[PDB]
């Protein structure tokens, strides 16, 4: 069961709302993260003018619809939107949906009652991304065409001046596309059209009124060298970094040398400053390789072409396999299960071990069936192979396996573990995962949502 990957279960098209009769798109999708464990998962899909809110329920009937639309909100202003994140009312604990777009304001909607909670005003240009802090659900970050990040607090003490921090200075010089929080809520990644990925350290914010935001002028890590193109999606994976750029058809996994979230958070005066204008990378963290970062792996995502503003999403949850998902610009949805890499390495080591210890004469038995490495040994008086490794073995088979699972070349291309075709011409913009990982929703152009499921309950 734990090795199951999703399959297409439901899809829908939301009526064109940017009329030209089909150039509307869903730009974002996000599952609500504050529901009690086991509750039916709920996501919001954000089009240019609407927020579409759906609950997903598993069905025993293959023909029944698991998706039901429980709230539909229109931005009755002039803004076209493309970013969303969830927060909560700090008094009532009701869900709050934040929505931001090309006029540079964040609208915070009380979604169960269908009213506005508040607006967050201050940015000098359109907002292209929002993220909520995992450590504090009242803290949200916005990334803007004005080249800054603003950090906002919905806590009651900050009602009269809710911008608690600005990430400014000269770290970025063009429109930002992507902002992300570390799980500890104190490190922020930003990136965009200037091809710079920046890591910033947030101070602690006082639990009282702040007449002005704290301004941070210097990131603690900065580099334009991981990609050679505009960067439109970044995220932490634990302490590791995932990012992708336009024209590269990869998602890059990499790390900052010397960065660990077990260490104390550095203060703003620890940041490096641009003393030398020829350095395209600088880092507070530099302690092994002499460099300040190490490229680790590249997930192959073919046929993104020249498209940008396409985002991936990792499902990372205790006790479940981590799954990377991404849809390209030619009607494909890709999945990688990061737990397959280790089990394939273990199996390749078990194979080569017994090949020497027995002069090339070993037997290979699939896992998953009723046979143990014990019952199998009772027969010949033996290597266990994961059942998902599918064809000694032919060179073409070993080549196919290494393309999917070999992690030995940082500039290699790791082929998707599952590749699902999409009918029609479709460009993926965003991926979201339900809390229990049984639903994966891809949204994109044509106002289309693709809903994938595993661990279903359908029967006959």
């Amino acid at each position: 069961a734990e090795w199951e990957l999703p399959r297409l279960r439901t899809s829908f098209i939301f009526q064109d709302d940017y009329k030209s009769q089909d150039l509307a798109e869903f730009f974002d999708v996000k599952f609500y993260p504050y529901s009690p464990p086991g509750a039916p998962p709920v996501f919001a899909a954000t089009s240019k003018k609407h927020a579409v809110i759906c609950r997903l329920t598993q069905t025993t009937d293959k023909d029944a619809n698991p998706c039901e639309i429980i709230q539909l909100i229109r931005d009755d202003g002039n803004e076209a939107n493309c970013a969303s994140c969830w927060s909560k009312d700090p008094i009532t604990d009701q869900p709050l949906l934040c929505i931001a777009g090309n006029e540079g304001n964040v609208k915070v909607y009380n979604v169960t009652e269908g009213k506005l909670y508040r607006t967050l005003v201050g940015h000098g240009g359109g907002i292209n991304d929002l993220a909520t802090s995992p450590a504090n659900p009242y803290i949200i970050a916005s990334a803007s065409d004005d080249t800054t990040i603003r950090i906002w607090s919905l806590a009651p003490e900050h009602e009269k001046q809710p911008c608690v921090c600005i990430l400014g200075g000269e770290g970025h010089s063009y429109d930002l596309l992507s902002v992300a929080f570390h799980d500890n809520g104190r490190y922020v990644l930003s990136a965009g059209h200037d091809q710079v990925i920046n890591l910033w350290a947030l101070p602690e914010f006082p639990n009282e009124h702040m007449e002005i935001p704290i301004v941070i002028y210097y990131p603690h890590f900065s580099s334009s060298e991981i990609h050679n193109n505009l960067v439109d999606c970044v995220a932490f994976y634990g302490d590791l970094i995932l990012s992708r750029a336009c024209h590269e058809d990869t998602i890059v996994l990499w790390r900052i040398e010397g960065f660990s979230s077990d260490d104390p958070i550095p203060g703003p005066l620890d940041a490096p400053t641009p003393t030398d204008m020829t350095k395209q990378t600088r880092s507070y963290f530099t302690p092994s390789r002499p460099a300040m970062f190490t490229r680790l792996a590249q997930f192959h995502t073919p046929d993104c072409g020249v498209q940008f503003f396409m985002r991936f999403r990792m499902y990372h949850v205790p006790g479940k396999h981590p799954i990377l998902a991404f849809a390209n610009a030619k009607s494909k949805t890709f999945f990688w299960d990061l737990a397959r890499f280790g089990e394939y390495a273990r199996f390749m080591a078990d194979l080569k071990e017994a090949q020497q210890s027995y002069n090339g004469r070993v037997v290979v038995v699939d896992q998953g069936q009723g046979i143990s490495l014990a019952q199998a040994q009772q027969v010949h008086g033996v290597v266990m192979k994961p059942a998902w490794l599918v064809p000694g073995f032919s060179r073409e088979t070993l080549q196919a396996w290494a393309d999917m699972y070999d992690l030995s070349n940082p500039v290699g291309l790791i082929k998707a573990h599952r590749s699902l075709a999409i009918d029609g011409a479709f460009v993926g913009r965003q991926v979201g995962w339900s809390p229990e990982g049984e639903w994966c929703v891809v949204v994109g152009n044509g106002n289309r949502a693709l809903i994938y499921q595993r661990w279903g309950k359908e029967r006959g």
Partner: peptide, 7 residues
């Protein structure tokens, strides 16, 4: 050249 909207 990079492109943002759908093709």
């Amino acid at each position: 050249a990079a492109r943002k909207s759908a093709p």
